[PDB]
């Protein structure tokens, strides 16, 4: 896992924990004050930057699991959204997903439908239309040679 990016994501989630629930006003305030889209290209080897963004998105989606309040979950999901929409890497790295995670997000969409946390279904639907999710069995790659 990416060490520094893990700490950055945890700090952003801690800030979203004190922000409003799902209100996009606080997400804009965060993007303004701290700019969680901190670094994408800088100046580094092409494949190094590529794997940097890859591990970023992978760890973010892995952290995006079911248990957390409506703050942490939304924060992780829309951190992923922003990282994908501000993709400065030439390839648009797809967000790594799990098989049952699709049914999980479908149940989340159903909850949004039978709820009124507005703009959340909107951002998630835009992300889906953007063709960003690529699903697998494990949030990372695994072997037996380690």
């Amino acid at each position: 896992t990416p060490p520094g990016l893990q700490t950055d994501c945890e700090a952003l989630l801690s800030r979203f924990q004190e922000t409003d629930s799902v209100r996009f006003e606080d997400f804009t305030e965060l993007w303004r004050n701290m700019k969680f889209g901190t670094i994408f290209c800088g100046r580094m080897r092409n494949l190094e930057k590529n794997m940097f963004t890859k591990e970023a998105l992978a760890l973010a989606w892995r952290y995006f699991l079911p248990p957390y309040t409506f703050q942490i979950r939304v924060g992780a999901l829309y951190l992923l959204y922003g990282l994908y929409n501000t993709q400065l890497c030439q390839p648009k790295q797809k967000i790594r997903v799990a098989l049952k995670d699709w049914d999980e997000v479908l149940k989340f969409q159903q909850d949004l439908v039978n709820a009124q946390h507005f703009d959340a279904a909107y951002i998630f639907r835009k992300l889906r239309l953007d063709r960003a999710f690529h699903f697998t069995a494990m949030p990372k790659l695994l072997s037996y040679r380690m």
Binding site: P3, G4, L5, T7, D8, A11, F24, T28, W31, M34, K35, G37, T38, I39, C41, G42, R43, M44, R45, N46, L47, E48, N50, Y81, G82, N85, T86, P91, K92, K94, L99, K100, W102, D103, L106, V113, F118, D119, A121, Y122, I123, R125, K126, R131, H134, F135, T136, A137, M138, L141, L142, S143, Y144, R145, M146
Partner: protein, 374 residues
């Protein structure tokens, strides 16, 4: 024989090691069923635009632009941070600056990234390539499986293990294609003694002679029956496994030209076998199962292009140390060592006189260096 009864979801069995048994064809079928797809075409956009999205939201749950009109403006690039990443309280930027300093110390310009550029080019080789024929277009939702292979012993048993190539395979395609695509050195290897006749062209290579090959996945033996010269080592394997109550249950036998990747029952992260040429065994590790995408290779003809290829060091001629060896000599007096190695010119000028007569007694064989594919 039917597949092992199990849920399509790959429920875990060992922490961060591997999941339980499951089917592949039903996996892909349920994967395509639980969503609509119709997005692997790259037709987002290259005028009336508001009414179309209005009608779209009208079928959606909100049927209003109140939130969309604000969120589409918020989620833009004109309000996004080229510039030096500094002057802000950060955490990873410290590690970034430390890496920049370590680079400026010894790393010179932008290079020495051999494996990095290898991965880059091997991934770009499959970006938006179209098939030659219109009938070769990969349909949406096709299963793509990533499969690492560990054939060889010649590598770093110390470096966490990075022995050999990784392949991508399509579900609907047959396993015989993967069999024929695995680039094994033993297939190019050639047997026979050619000390007296060095100029004789080696004929009937091991690939053509030893056509015996078979896969082994979860106690299922897939034996190739495409050629009339293929034997059945699974026969002796089953004989051994059944001659004594060693705890191994009955194993099923099937053909390789009738079972595809879909009909297999595998465990992601579990080692399976691919044994050919008698003792040439490959440890097969199917790691990931994913669907096709417009960014991936959409041409069914060249899918098994590897996503990874391990570098291998060629054996240099022991005499001149300038050319790669092509002949291996045993019991050679003129040779400095017993497991010796010579190239064409050195072997000719050392082991033969001005007319070509065999100087001295020795045993020479065509040394097919492992670094022949790359």
């Amino acid at each position: 024989v039917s597949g092992s009864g199990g849920c399509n979801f790959p429920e875990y069995e060992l922490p961060e090691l591997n999941t339980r048994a499951f089917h592949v064809g039903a996996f892909g079928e349920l994967w395509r069923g639980r969503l609509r797809g119709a997005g692997d075409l790259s037709l987002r956009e290259p005028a009336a635009d508001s009414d179309r999205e209005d009608a779209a939201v009208a079928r959606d749950l909100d049927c209003s632009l109140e939130a969309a009109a604000e969120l589409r403006a918020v989620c833009g690039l004109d309000k996004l941070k080229e510039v030096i990443p500094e002057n802000t309280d950060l955490v990873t930027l410290g590690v970034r600056k430390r890496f920049l300093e370590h680079r400026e110390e010894t790393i010179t310009i932008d290079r020495a990234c051999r494996q990095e550029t290898f991965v880059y080019e091997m991934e770009s080789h499959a970006i938006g390539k179209k098939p030659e024929n219109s009938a070769d277009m990969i349909e949406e939702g096709e299963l793509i499986l990533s499969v690492n292979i560990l054939y060889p012993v010649i590598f770093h048993k110390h470096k966490e293990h990075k022995p050999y190539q990784t392949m991508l395979v399509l579900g609907s395609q047959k396993l015989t294609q993967l069999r024929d695509s695995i680039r094994c050195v033993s297939d190019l290897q050639i047997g026979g003694e050619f000390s007296n006749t060095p100029d004789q062209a080696p004929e009937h290579i091991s690939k053509d002679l030893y056509k015996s090959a078979f896969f082994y996945f979860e106690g299922t033996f897939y034996n190739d029956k495409r050629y009339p010269e293929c034997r059945d080592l699974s026969r002796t394997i089953i004989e051994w496994s059944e001659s004594h109550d060693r705890g191994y249950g009955k194993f099923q036998t099937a053909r390789m030209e009738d079972f595809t990747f879909n009909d297999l029952c595998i465990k992601l992260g579990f080692p399976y076998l691919y044994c050919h040429q008698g003792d040439c065994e490959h440890v097969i590790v199917i790691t990931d199962i994913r669907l096709v995408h417009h960014d991936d290779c959409l041409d069914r003809t060249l899918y098994p292009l590897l996503i990874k290829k391990h570098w291998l060091w060629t054996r240099k001629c022991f005499v001149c140390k300038m050319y790669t060896a092509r002949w291996v000599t045993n019991n050679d007096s003129f040779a400095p060592e017993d497991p010796c190695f010579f190239c064409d010119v050195c072997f000719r000028m050392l082991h033969y006189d001005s007319e070509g007569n065999k100087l001295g007694e020795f045993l020479a064989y065509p040394y097919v260096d492992p670094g022949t594919f790359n």
